[PDB]
Amino acid sequence: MKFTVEREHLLKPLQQVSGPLPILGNLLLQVADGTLSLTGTDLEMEMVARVALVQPHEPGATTVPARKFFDICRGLPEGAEIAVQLEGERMLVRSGRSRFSLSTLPAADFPNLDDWQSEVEFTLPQATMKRLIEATQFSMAHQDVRYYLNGMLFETEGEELRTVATDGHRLAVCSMPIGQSLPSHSVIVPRKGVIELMRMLDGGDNPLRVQIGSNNIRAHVGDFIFTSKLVDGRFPDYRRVLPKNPDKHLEAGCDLLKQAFARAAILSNEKFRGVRLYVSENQLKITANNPEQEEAEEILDVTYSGAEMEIGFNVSYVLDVLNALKCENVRMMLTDSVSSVQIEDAASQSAAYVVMPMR
Amino acid sequence: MKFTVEREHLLKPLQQVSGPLPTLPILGNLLLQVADGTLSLTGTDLEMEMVARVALVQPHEPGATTVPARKFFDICRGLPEGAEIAVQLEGERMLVRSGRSRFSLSTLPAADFPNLDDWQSEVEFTLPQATMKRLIEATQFSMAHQDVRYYLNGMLFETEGEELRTVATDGHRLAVCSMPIGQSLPSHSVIVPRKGVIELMRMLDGGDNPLRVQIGSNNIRAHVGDFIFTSKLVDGRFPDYRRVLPKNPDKHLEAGCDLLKQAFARAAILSNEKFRGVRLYVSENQLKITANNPEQEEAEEILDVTYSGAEMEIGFNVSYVLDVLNALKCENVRMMLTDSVSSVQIEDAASQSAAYVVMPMR
Ligand SMILES: O=C1Nc2ccc(Cl)cc2C1=O
Ligand SMILES: [Ca+2]
Ligand SMILES: [Ca+2]
Ligand SMILES: [Ca+2]
Ligand SMILES: [Ca+2]
Ligand SMILES: [Cl-]
């Protein structure tokens, strides 16, 4: 295996394949068909990047330490050409009068996701996928014993792709049109897979091809291909989580609401930050207190219809939703003091959030 | 005690005075004092204190109390830009009001707030903010961090004649910087605790107004604008820095700072993860840097330099070298060598104002 390539053409590939990250700490390099392919994996998912080779090259494959190789390439000057030469247990890297010998492990030892079969496929702009994940990812569970919640549901229905995330306490759901009729289908992508996928997608106008199998998902954009195993469990139905008949409706400025929550939380319990909402005619009062008997109170002029009520919320859950919305006005749909609330952008129905009350 | 102040007149002062801030509750509090048209805020960790004075243009009433620094700061920061922040002491609570935002904070008496003892200045001088910033940035990275030799966990400040000098060492590497001040000073040598050095550094906003320094036998004070920093000194005798400088480092090497920095940075990748050793081979107009690790991996960098001394091989901890090159921030570097078992002295090729001594490694 031998190739020469511009540093500039390796930089983004190396960045992408380095997260998922003993051979799991290595990158797989393969020269074939005038292409350098770089692969990183953690056994559950894999990222592949391809780079065209113009300069003379020789086919072959090896694995090298990812961080060492990345740091070498990044550390070379802008404009550097990088020559690579496999020599048994070492891979030689040369650029100008900078020379490196890295230890190798065999390509044959590198874990390979087993072959699988695609069952549903579609293309959508990477920007749409990014929107769907950003709208919902914060509501995924982290290391719950309900293993099926440590990830995100991807659902196709009609002409929409929908994402759902929940940790049992709050839920986020977002649906986007993709311009083609799809079979009805749902799979759970593991949370680390979601985060890696999210990081693969930049700001560009770029078609993203998605292929979903029984046990795997794959996304292809430009010269990158991401593949993850799926989570094999039964995900809750968001339709049954949405409040069925809220009779109380609050509307307020997103940022005013956000800043009022954030201030009141200062004097909530540091270990478990919650605030009390008192809603009445045209007014919202948010209060907090802590074991030192310190107290905060915020009064806001708001749009409100319904009976007077008091209800508590975990601050981080509400702030997470308001931060995700990034909009002018927010709507809160309430039922009673012991039932979850729905929160949406007043000007958009593409996402919705359900939050259980606290206390 | 009552005052009302515009949010942004409180914020920077609150941020500054919270610098030294845990162990007991009152040490997590700021002292607030209204007297003679001024709100004074003070934070302390018992070794040092930072004081801010904020002018009061709105009606106020005199008095003092202490309140939790983090909570009070976060409240002020979280209020909208231009918010008027009204404060009223009410015994065991201090009330804060802005618009229809209301907060009650638990207080501890001003009379219980720890007070750095009174002391007398022995030397005083004024200097540009930028000169003090230069002196500290040039040397601060060479201070020890929690070394059992307490005298190294700090920075020597030395006045003599028309010069102020800083020195820092951790026993393995040393930094010294000297700047003219245009006033003749008595000979004084003091050790400023590392936390105080960092606070002093962070109080320099890099604007026009000068810094006024006062030094006693056991204290140091710096006044800039409406901030006053005071610290106790490390009661210790700093080792004689002058005799750690190589006595005749005749082999001089010159090369581009960034050229060197990047080559060492790349070589470091394949250096021992714990010991970080690199090898320098100097020969006529050439520097070869090598690294290898226990796994038998190897890096080599060859650089064109100016060098006409004898060939020699010497090893260094690459982090110590990179620290120096990063501090220098200059076009060219001069390295002054003796032999394979003696320290190197490194300087900006353009100036002797800062010098760096790094011991070799086996
Ligand atoms: O299984 C679930 N039931 C729920 C009720 C309310 C919210 Cl916010 C989430 C969930 C679940 O995940
Ligand atoms: Ca080039
Ligand atoms: Ca290897
Ligand atoms: Ca090997
Ligand atoms: Ca594609
Ligand atoms: Cl390419």
Side-chain angles (χ1 to χ4, degrees), chain A residues 1 3-11 13-77 79-93 95-133 135-191 193-243 245-257 259-269 271-280 282-359, chain B residues 1-11 13-101 103-272 274-362:
Chain A
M1 189 192 73
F3 60 89
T4 297
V5 65
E6 296 188 16
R7 175 180 175 271
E8 196 64 26
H9 302 147
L10 293 179
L11 254 38
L14 282 172
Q15 200 174 40
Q16 284 294 318
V17 300
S18 288
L21 296 68
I23 203 170
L24 302 182
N26 284 194
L27 293 184
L28 173 63
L29 303 188
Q30 302 171 103
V31 181
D33 198 24
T35 304
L36 171 63
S37 291
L38 303 92
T39 309
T41 188
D42 73 0
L43 298 176
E44 300 302 310
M45 70 201 93
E46 145 200 303
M47 177 65 79
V48 179
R50 301 199 206 278
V51 176
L53 300 174
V54 259
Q55 308 196 42
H57 51 272
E58 176 189 308
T62 194
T63 76
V64 289
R67 189 50 165 175
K68 281 169 188 172
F69 185 61
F70 186 21
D71 286 350
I72 290 163
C73 293
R74 197 167 70 261
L76 286 168
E81 304 286 354
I82 305 178
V84 166
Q85 188 178 307
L86 179 58
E87 232 139 73
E89 302 305 293
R90 299 291 185 275
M91 191 183 86
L92 272 42
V93 180
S95 182
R97 297 197 292 172
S98 310
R99 299 170 62 241
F100 312 82
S101 185
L102 297 175
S103 187
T104 60
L105 289 164
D109 302 351
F110 198 78
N112 204 321
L113 276 176
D114 287 90
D115 294 295
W116 54 280
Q117 328 282 354
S118 182
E119 297 190 345
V120 59
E121 302 185 342
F122 51 87
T123 297
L124 76 175
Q126 77 174 161
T128 303
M129 185 61 84
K130 187 166 192 70
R131 160 57 174 168
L132 285 165
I133 298 175
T136 58
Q137 70 84 203
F138 65 89
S139 294
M140 297 188 299
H142 305 236
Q143 286 180 4
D144 200 295
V145 295
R146 293 116 101 235
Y147 67 93
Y148 52 88
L149 300 182
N150 302 326
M152 180 178 291
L153 191 76
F154 285 74
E155 181 177 13
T156 54
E157 179 175 17
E159 296 198 2
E160 294 185 320
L161 176 61
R162 175 162 50 251
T163 55
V164 187
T166 185
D167 65 4
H169 300 263
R170 38 81 180 275
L171 180 142
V173 55
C174 183
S175 306
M176 288 288 267
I178 63 172
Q180 49 184 308
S181 70
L182 309 154
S184 293
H185 202 254
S186 323
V187 295
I188 306 161
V189 177
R191 60 169 294 109
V194 173
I195 293 159
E196 180 162 323
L197 179 51
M198 188 162 76
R199 293 193 29 257
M200 191 181 55
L201 316 183
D202 69 6
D205 295 321
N206 256 280
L208 176 79
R209 177 57 158 193
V210 178
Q211 297 180 102
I212 297 168
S214 58
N215 299 108
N216 305 85
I217 186 165
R218 171 167 297 169
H220 193 158
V221 64
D223 304 315
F224 304 88
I225 310 172
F226 169 75
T227 308
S228 179
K229 295 183 192 169
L230 299 174
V231 181
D232 190 45
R234 186 163 292 273
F235 202 83
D237 184 347
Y238 79 97
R239 294 152 280 263
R240 294 159 70 166
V241 179
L242 300 179
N245 189 34
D247 59 353
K248 295 167 186 60
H249 294 83
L250 176 128
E251 306 186 31
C254 185
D255 209 73
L256 280 169
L257 193 60
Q259 303 320 326
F261 264 81
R263 284 193 301 271
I266 294 159
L267 300 181
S268 67
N269 197 117
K271 266 72 166 65
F272 190 26
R273 313 279 236 174
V275 295
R276 280 196 189 104
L277 278 55
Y278 296 81
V279 68
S280 56
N282 312 151
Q283 200 156 101
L284 173 62
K285 184 169 72 197
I286 300 160
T287 63
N289 70 109
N290 66 198
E292 295 60 46
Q293 295 192 108
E294 293 166 336
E295 305 177 70
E297 176 189 275
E298 294 282 347
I299 295 167
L300 295 188
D301 294 328
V302 299
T303 299
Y304 184 71
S305 59
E308 291 192 346
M309 67 166 313
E310 190 266 313
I311 188 164
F313 289 112
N314 180 293
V315 170
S316 79
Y317 298 160
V318 171
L319 292 180
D320 284 353
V321 169
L322 299 179
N323 283 316
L325 287 173
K326 301 186 188 305
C327 64
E328 274 287 290
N329 296 113
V330 60
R331 201 194 323 284
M332 291 187 55
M333 309 159 72
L334 311 94
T335 296
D336 63 27
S337 82
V338 295
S339 293
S340 303
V341 64
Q342 187 163 325
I343 304 175
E344 302 167 343
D345 180 344
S348 169
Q349 260 146 241
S350 81
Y353 301 90
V354 180
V355 178
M356 288 183 75
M358 174 180 174
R359 208 171 278 96
Chain B
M1 188 195 74
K2 298 180 77 154
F3 62 87
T4 305
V5 178
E6 232 180 67
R7 165 185 178 269
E8 294 72 34
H9 278 247
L10 254 191
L11 280 172
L14 281 173
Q15 177 158 162
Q16 278 298 125
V17 301
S18 297
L21 323 203
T23 52
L24 289 177
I26 199 159
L27 291 178
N29 284 9
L30 307 175
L31 172 64
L32 318 188
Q33 294 164 302
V34 177
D36 280 345
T38 297
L39 168 62
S40 296
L41 314 168
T42 309
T44 188
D45 66 1
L46 302 180
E47 186 72 11
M48 69 199 183
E49 70 176 32
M50 177 67 81
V51 182
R53 324 227 92 98
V54 4
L56 301 172
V57 302
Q58 309 198 43
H60 48 276
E61 298 176 2
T65 191
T66 79
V67 286
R70 180 85 260 168
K71 290 162 175 172
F72 188 45
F73 173 72
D74 284 346
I75 287 165
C76 294
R77 180 186 55 172
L79 284 166
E81 191 79 18
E84 299 299 339
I85 305 187
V87 173
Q88 182 170 329
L89 179 56
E90 298 181 13
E92 298 74 21
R93 310 155 76 214
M94 190 182 88
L95 270 56
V96 181
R97 305 171 101 85
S98 186
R100 286 176 295 177
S101 308
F103 310 89
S104 191
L105 297 176
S106 191
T107 64
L108 293 166
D112 295 336
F113 194 75
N115 209 137
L116 274 193
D117 290 336
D118 237 78
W119 52 280
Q120 174 58 228
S121 178
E122 294 184 3
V123 300
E124 305 186 340
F125 55 93
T126 301
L127 73 168
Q129 199 139 218
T131 303
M132 181 61 75
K133 196 188 199 81
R134 155 59 169 173
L135 288 165
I136 295 172
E137 282 183 337
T139 63
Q140 175 271 340
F141 75 91
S142 293
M143 299 187 294
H145 311 249
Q146 276 93 318
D147 195 289
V148 70
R149 302 113 103 199
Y150 315 126
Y151 54 85
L152 297 185
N153 300 328
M155 177 177 293
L156 186 70
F157 281 71
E158 215 171 53
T159 60
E160 69 160 46
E162 305 196 340
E163 279 220 324
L164 178 61
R165 167 163 48 261
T166 47
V167 192
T169 188
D170 65 4
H172 308 285
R173 38 86 177 274
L174 180 138
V176 52
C177 183
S178 303
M179 295 289 282
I181 71 271
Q183 306 145 57
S184 191
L185 308 173
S187 295
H188 207 74
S189 301
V190 298
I191 306 168
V192 176
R194 54 164 307 116
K195 206 174 155 195
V197 173
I198 287 162
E199 282 303 317
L200 179 44
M201 181 55 208
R202 175 180 162 268
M203 87 183 306
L204 308 173
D205 72 351
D208 264 355
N209 58 36
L211 178 68
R212 180 72 172 166
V213 180
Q214 295 174 294
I215 317 185
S217 55
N218 299 110
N219 297 80
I220 188 164
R221 172 168 295 164
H223 303 80
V224 55
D226 299 301
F227 291 100
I228 308 149
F229 181 60
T230 311
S231 185
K232 290 169 64 170
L233 300 171
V234 178
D235 184 282
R237 301 181 60 79
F238 203 78
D240 204 344
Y241 94 77
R242 290 173 184 75
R243 327 306 160 193
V244 310
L245 260 62
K247 51 189 163 289
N248 202 58
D250 70 326
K251 305 161 190 64
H252 281 16
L253 181 147
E254 297 87 32
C257 190
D258 200 51
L259 183 81
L260 255 7
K261 184 197 299 197
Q262 301 313 338
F264 281 115
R266 288 187 300 269
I269 296 160
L270 304 185
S271 74
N272 182 297
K274 195 202 191 178
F275 297 110
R276 301 280 287 169
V278 292
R279 203 173 267 112
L280 285 61
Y281 303 80
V282 295
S283 63
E284 179 177 50
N285 294 339
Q286 184 169 292
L287 169 56
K288 179 170 80 170
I289 302 163
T290 64
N292 41 77
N293 53 25
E295 317 99 87
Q296 316 294 69
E297 285 169 329
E298 307 186 64
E300 175 184 289
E301 296 278 348
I302 297 177
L303 299 67
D304 293 333
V305 304
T306 306
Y307 184 72
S308 62
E311 290 187 355
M312 54 164 291
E313 179 201 328
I314 187 161
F316 295 105
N317 176 324
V318 74
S319 77
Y320 295 159
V321 180
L322 289 165
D323 286 351
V324 168
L325 300 178
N326 280 327
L328 281 171
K329 299 175 177 288
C330 57
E331 187 195 338
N332 297 106
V333 176
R334 177 166 295 110
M335 303 178 52
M336 306 154 82
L337 290 162
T338 299
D339 58 39
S340 59
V341 80
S342 300
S343 297
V344 63
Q345 183 166 320
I346 306 170
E347 295 178 4
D348 180 341
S351 170
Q352 285 181 76
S353 72
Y356 300 92
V357 181
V358 182
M359 292 186 67
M361 145 172 274
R362 298 299 125 216

